[PDB]
């Protein structure tokens, strides 16, 4: 509901007067204290989140009007105030009560609070000080109780709600750093009636882009039907007083011989724009190579403008879009629509912006109609995605030729006439953010102070821009290459272009022919490129030709190829090389900005000309912080959703930890995380709205959600690399392997937890292997690490690597290591190393490939130039002696861990308990005799067989019992059902719950053999003695 607005200097918690009509027809009569919510509409891409207030009846207020304290928004009503808001009285008067509220207080009041004797006395003192009441007063967040004294630091449960001042905890924090001095209630920076006396001629003031579009409803005055938004300007009230007219008719802006007519309105008070500056939309700003400061003057003759609109001359500005075949039709239609307005004004040298939708290029909505054909409301469904300009040159003068400075265009007299293509420079990003104004998909705003590589590119391009007045052909090609996809190359290029104001050509791999290129593909490619470029370059100064994914077109010679097929490759290479340099000297300032995903495959004939190659690393910790700060920003989330409830993040989030916890992820991954978080938050919001609980007026992202969304993103990545779905073993099952447990912990996790002491290039001993008798945990430990440590887990399925041909095993090994090296925190599990790394050069062997492969292992595993040692290697075998020594060395496999038979009743009971853990054990009997009765030749795996056998016996008992029950039932009835039918017709869940009684154990233990003989065990004992005894 829309309510008229006015402000007062009352207290923050003073009741808000509301008109009788609303209080009666909508206000709840049963409520002792009525509460409503207000939204302030402000110049931005969305409405503000609602703020709650307490209201009371007031007969003095006119129809649908409200009065509120201006101090609730940190200002005073000295300047013109806003005249309306959106309001709704809460149905059922539902409001939440905050359990705790955090306040920041000044030193003097905190000293007074200690001086105050008692807790209750202090509570009453605060009651009187800031009008805070139990279950009556409602608090908000980011608000100030009084200028420079106290501020609401935080509110945990909700941004606003009631306070149980009797019990709600009040976290009072002393302002030890005097931050509260920064608080400022929209106060004036002093004020003078005449800072300069009699300065009626002109005033000099700053010009900067208006940050967002303007909606007519927010305008204080009442302009006419048409010809308003194209010449708007907004300023502070006092600036109007310095001009001697409040929101005067027309103003003029004059510098460098360019004079334009503008209309100046008052900037409305609540907005937080800067002081003493002109805020204008891009339409007027574009006309200038504007200086930071600019002078303005009165122009009364503007009210007497002349409609001399006959035979106007229009021109399409140079640009990438203007030269496209399909767009041209919609461009024409939208230009005719723009000039269809009755009273638009215009003057020579003006740039007129024209927005339109990119994807409506083919949707001819309807033909022209005799009557009742209009676009106004029909367009509301779609919002624009691309922008162009038009450059205006001349117009008729007629008998009114005495003046030609400014004129109107009338559809009843104006006709569409155009000349050839002109040229002019774009607008540098530093001066006006056009995307921001038109809500486009904003290019990421890099910050050169932080990102290294972008500075190089921008410097090169700006050098080629500045050399225009030096006038030499120094322009140089630039090639971008990256180690991985999705590192924002095209984004940073677009950033540079928009920053330096350089027209950008975006050719890409949407080519015409790439398969069976013999069918004149070379022509279809190069002719297309030449046609696309030649229609833009003669009208762009400077210009940039950007070739995305150039890697997949300028392919290099293949090792194995058809002798004649490669000829086409050579031809395309050479012709591309030629057209590379042709533009260099056929036009001034041309820069060739190519992109490649792997520079190794670019043709040397083409690359050799290249003189600047920037590698674009995956963003390190510092950058991800900024990237998060961007994607989480208000001007990003709130965009493109059109959800009726604005969006925002809760302030309790932490960039610093988030960044560190998102290591290795590329920017696209980051955006994916943000999007998923947004989804989950919206789902939570609608779930709460479905419930009967209190409904927040905003949806708040929470770090508690990001913490798991990042995990899901990482799991997605882990699926990308194709890792197996290892079972979910837990770190607790491992039992009597404490020594090896700690040994593993000291290497896999110790240099990974608190990553500061090990943060160095040292040889961090990424090698480890288990060896010993069969069945003592070697694979289980790996299975546990695979999921309990969050390290990527690669499985080498025994002799997986070995292969048919001579050299494909040597390719498989290298591919495995390369892919693992792609994801730095990764593990390699060489299961049964025997099959892959036999002793080198034995006489009892043939073929020799087993030697080549082990040599390749010795090479790639350790080698030289090794870095980023996070690649662990875990190996296992039944017997190591078949391995070659050259592996049994530090750097590859330092300690050989002998996970021997526990030989110890402590360990035996530990493993028996760990095996029995997760199923019920009847406690009438003690298990220790199971350790005492087994001889120590029994083994971790055969204790597993013992447990499973005992279980199976005890559950066979239950099977027999249920068989007896079903037979009895069949005897009672006509024997009409079997056991299977019994289990769907009837159920006895509690009866089926098998519980093992150790009598079963004492039965089973008599029947199970040891997994190894003394003959084998002595062998492994001797092996250990050799390797460990020393």
């Amino acid at each position: 509901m829309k309510a008229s607005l006015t402000f007062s200097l009352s207290g923050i918690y003073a009741p808000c007067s509301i008109s009788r009509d609303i209080y009666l027809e909508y206000g709840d009569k049963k409520a002792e204290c009525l509460y409503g919510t207000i939204r302030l509409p402000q110049y931005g891409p969305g409405c503000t989140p609602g703020k709650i207030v307490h209201c009371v009846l007031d007969d003095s207020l006119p129809f649908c009007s409200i009065v509120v304290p201006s101090k609730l928004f940190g200002f005073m009503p000295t300047q013109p105030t806003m005249d309306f808001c959106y309001f709704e009285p809460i149905l059922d008067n539902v409001v939440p009560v905050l359990d705790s509220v955090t306040f920041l207080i000044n030193e003097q009041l905190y000293s007074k609070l200690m001086d105050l004797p008692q807790e209750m006395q202090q509570i009453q003192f605060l009651h009187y000080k800031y009008n805070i009441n139990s279950m009556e007063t409602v608090v908000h967040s980011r608000d100030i109780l009084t200028s420079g004294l106290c501020q609401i630091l935080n509110c945990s449960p909700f941004p606003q709600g009631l306070v149980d001042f009797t019990e709600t905890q009040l976290i009072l924090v002393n302002d030890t750093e005097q931050k509260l001095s920064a608080l400022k209630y929209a106060n004036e920076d002093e004020e003078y009636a005449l800072p300069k006396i009699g300065t009626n001629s002109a005033l000099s003031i700053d010009l900067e882009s208006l940050p967002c579009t303007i909606s007519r409803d927010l305008l204080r005055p009442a302009p006419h039907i048409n010809d308003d938004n194209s010449i708007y300007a907004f300023t502070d009230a006092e600036t109007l007083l310095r001009l001697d007219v409040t929101s005067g008719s027309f103003i003029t802006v004059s510098n460098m011989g360019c004079v334009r007519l503008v209309k100046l309105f008052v900037l409305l008070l609540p907005n937080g724009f800067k002081k003493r500056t002109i805020y204008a939309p891009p339409k007027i700003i574009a006309s200038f190579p504007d200086c930071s400061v600019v002078t303005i003057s009165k122009s009364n003759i503007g009210h007497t403008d002349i409609p001399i609109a006959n035979q106007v001359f229009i021109s399409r500005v140079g640009g990438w879009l203007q030269s496209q075949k399909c767009f041209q039709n919609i461009i024409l239609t939208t230009l005719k629509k723009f000039f269809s307005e009755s009273k638009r004004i215009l003057c020579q040298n003006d740039l007129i912006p024209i927005a339109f939708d990119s994807s409506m290029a083919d949707l001819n909505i309807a033909e022209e109609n005799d009557e009742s054909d209009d676009e106004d409301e029909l367009g509301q469904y779609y919002k624009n995605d691309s922008l162009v300009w038009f450059f205006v040159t001349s117009a008729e003068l007629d008998c009114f030729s005495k003046d030609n400075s400014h004129f109107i265009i009338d559809p009843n007299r104006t006709k569409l006439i155009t000349t050839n293509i002109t040229n002019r420079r774009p607008l540098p990003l530093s001066r006006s953010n056009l995307q921001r104004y038109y809500g486009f998909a904003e290019t990421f705003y890099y910050d050169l102070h932080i990102f290294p590589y972008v500075r190089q590119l921008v410097n090169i391009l700006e050098t080629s821009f500045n050399c225009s007045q030096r006038g030499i052909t120094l322009n140089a090609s630039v090639l971008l290459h990256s180690t991985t996809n999705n590192v924002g190359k095209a984004t940073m290029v677009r950033f540079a272009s928009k920053y330096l104001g350089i027209h950008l050509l975006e050719i890409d791999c949407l080519s015409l022919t790439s398969n069976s290129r013999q069918l004149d593909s070379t022509s279809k490619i190069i002719g297309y490129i030449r046609a696309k470029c030649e229609n833009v370059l003669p009208y762009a100064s400077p210009a940039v030709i950007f070739l995305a994914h150039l890697d997949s077109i300028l392919l290099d010679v293949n090792a194995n190829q058809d002798p004649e097929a490669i000829k086409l490759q050579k031809s395309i290479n050479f012709e591309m090389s030629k057209l590379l340099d042709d533009f260099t000297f056929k036009f001034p300032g041309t820069t060739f900005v190519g992109s490649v995903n792997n520079i190794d495959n670019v043709p040397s004939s083409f690359r050799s000309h290249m003189r600047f190659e920037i590698l674009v690393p995956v963003p390190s910790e510092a950058q991800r912080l900024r990237i998060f700060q961007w994607y989480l920003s208000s001007h990003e989330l709130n965009r493109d959703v059109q959800q009726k409830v604005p969006v925002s993040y809760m302030d309790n989030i932490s960039f610093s930890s988030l960044s560190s916890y998102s290591a290795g992820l590329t920017p696209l991954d980051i955006k994916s995380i943000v999007e998923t978080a947004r989804m989950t938050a919206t789902a939570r919001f609608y779930q709460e709205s479905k419930k009967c609980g209190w409904l927040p007026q905003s949806i708040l992202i929470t770090q508690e959600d990001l913490s798991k969304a990042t995990s899901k993103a990482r799991n997605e990545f882990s699926v990308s690399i194709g890792a197996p779905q290892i079972p979910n073993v837990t770190w607790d099952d491992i039992g009597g392997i404490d020594f090896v447990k700690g040994e593993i912990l000291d290497t896999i996790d110790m240099p990974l937890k608190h990553p500061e002491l090990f943060t160095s290039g040292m040889k961090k001993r990424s090698g480890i292997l288990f060896y010993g008798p069969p069945g003592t945990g070697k694979t289980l430990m790996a299975k546990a690490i695979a999921t309990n440590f969050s390290l990527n887990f690669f499985s080498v399925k025994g002799p997986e690597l070995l292969n048919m041909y001579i050299g494909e095993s040597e390719a498989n090994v290298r591919r495995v290591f390369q892919k693992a090296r792609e994801a730095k925190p990764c593990v390699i599990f060489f299961d049964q190393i025997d099959s892959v790394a036999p002793k080198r050069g034995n006489q009892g062997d043939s073929g020799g490939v087993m030697d080549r492969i082990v040599s390749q292992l010795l090479a790639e595993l350790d080698g030289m130039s090794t870095d980023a040692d996070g690649v662990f290697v875990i190996g296992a075998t039944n017997r190591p002696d078949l391995l070659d020594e050259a592996l049994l060395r530090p750097g590859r496999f330092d300690k050989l861990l002998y996970l021997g038979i526990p030989d110890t009743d402590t360990k035996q009971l530990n493993i028996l308990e760990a095996l029995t853990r997760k199923f019920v054990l009847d406690n009438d009997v003690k298990l220790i005799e199971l350790a005492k009765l087994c001889p120590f030749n029994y083994t971790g795996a055969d204790f597993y067989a013992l447990c499973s056998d005992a279980m199976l016996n005890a559950m066979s008992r239950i099977a027999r019992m249920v068989e007896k029950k079903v037979s009895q039932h069949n005897e009672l009835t006509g024997e009409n059902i079997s056991t299977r039918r019994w289990f769907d017709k009837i159920a006895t869940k509690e009866d089926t719950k098998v519980v093992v009684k150790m009598e079963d154990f004492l039965k089973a233990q008599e029947q199970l053999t040891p997994s190894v003989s003394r003959a084998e065990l002595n062998h492994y004992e001797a092996v250990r003695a050799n390797f460990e005894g020393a």
């Binding site: 955090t102 207080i105 905190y110 609070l113 807790e119 202090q122 509570i123 630091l153 935080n154 019990e167 709600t168 905890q169 009040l170 976290i171 009072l172 924090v173 002393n174 030890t176 750093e177 931050k179 912080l625 302030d651 309790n652 932490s654 960039f655 610093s656 000291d746 110790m750 500061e756 002491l757 020594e885 049994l888 060395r889 530090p890 330092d894 300690k895 050799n1026 020393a1030």
Partner: protein, 102 residues
């Protein structure tokens, strides 16, 4: 590794016992809350979030990690000679045969 393990074991309580003066707290209306230390920590973390900064100061190397001979000798005790003792003779023989001939 053994020395850093011992240092970390000894340093566990170093950062827990001392008081924190980076922010001052009044603690009014604290009745009805069983948690005391965790609530103080959460208040301090809230204030730090409001006043978060990324810069950090350096520290002396010796009090981060240090090498001592007492643990070094014990580490030497747990020997791990790479060369196979039974294979050193064979390797010596083959090396000599390579050196003298071809």
């Amino acid at each position: 590794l053994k020395s850093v393990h011992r240092w970390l074991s000894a340093a566990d309580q170093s950062e827990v016992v001392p008081g924190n003066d980076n922010i001052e707290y009044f603690s009014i209306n604290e009745h009805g809350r069983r948690e005391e230390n965790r609530l103080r920590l959460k208040t301090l973390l809230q204030q730090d979030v409001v006043h978060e900064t990324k810069t950090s100061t350096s520290a002396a190397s010796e009090l981060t990690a240090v090498v001592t001979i007492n643990d070094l000798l014990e580490a030497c005790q747990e020997t791990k000679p790479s060369i196979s003792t039974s294979e050193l003779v064979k390797l010596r023989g083959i090396y000599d045969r390579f050196q003298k001939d071809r």
